[PDB]
Design a protein around this ligand. Structure first.
Ligand SMILES: CC1(C)C(=O)Nc2ccc(Br)cc21
Length: 209
């Protein structure tokens, strides 16, 4: 059972700008997704300070980066607070309508795409490098769901029958053919060191056979 939704017009416009604008500094997508994971880990940590049972779904707070050259995917896994189905539908827990408005005003006022995270819509920078994005998520108060979009104005949501997650979010980037450098270990390491050196959770870069 798969539900198909239209993006709000402003979000579809944001996605088309990210996909169509000539902009060489694509590597910032990874900083933005790691920052989002850190924010989600902060949220479950704060909740756990007054209710330790919030971590019954997993005590470890971490970020894993998993490249797969055979599938041409880069997956960012975190054990943060996760998202409910309602969160997924509501622009993956963001205030994307107002954030997009502020971002596009900044772009015509000097700013560049790399500042996207300052407007709360950094997730969508995934489309700098991915032709399709799948988001698997599990929040303590809901079931496990899969969100997916190849842009083009729509996204899908379905209950996820895949591997149970416990709690958190997996962002699966199905990379564009010409963006496979982001599967190479030395390139990922360079980006993490350059942009994510102060993230307060362990970031483990998995290696491949
Ligand atoms: C914003 C979004 C979708 C992301 O890009 N990464 C991540 C991690 C945890 C949660 Br909850 C939500 C997210």
């Amino acid at each position: 059972e798969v539900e198909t939704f239209a993006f709000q017009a402003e979000i579809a416009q944001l996605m088309s700008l990210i996909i169509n604008t000539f902009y060489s500094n694509k590597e910032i997508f990874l900083r933005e997704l790691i920052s989002n994971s850190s924010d989600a880990l902060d949220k479950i940590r704060y909740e756990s300070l007054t209710d330790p049972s919030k971590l019954d779904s997993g005590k470890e707070l971490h970020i894993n980066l998993i490249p797969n050259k055979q599938d041409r995917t880069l997956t960012i896994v975190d054990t943060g607070i996760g998202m409910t189905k309602a969160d997924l539908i509501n622009n993956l827990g963001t205030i994307a309508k107002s954030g997009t408005k502020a971002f596009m005003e900044a772009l015509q006022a000097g700013a560049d795409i790399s500042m996207i995270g300052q407007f709360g819509v950094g997730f969508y920078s995934a489309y700098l490098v991915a032709e399709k994005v799948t988001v698997i998520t599990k929040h303590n108060d809901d079931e496990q769901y899969a969100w997916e979009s190849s842009a083009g104005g729509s996204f899908t949501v379905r209950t996820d029958t895949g591997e149970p997650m416990g709690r958190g979010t997996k962002v699966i980037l199905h990379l564009k053919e010409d963006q496979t450098e982001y599967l190479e270990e030395r390139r990922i390491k360079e980006i993490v060191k350059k942009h994510s050196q102060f993230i307060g959770y362990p970031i483990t870069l998995f290696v491949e056979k």
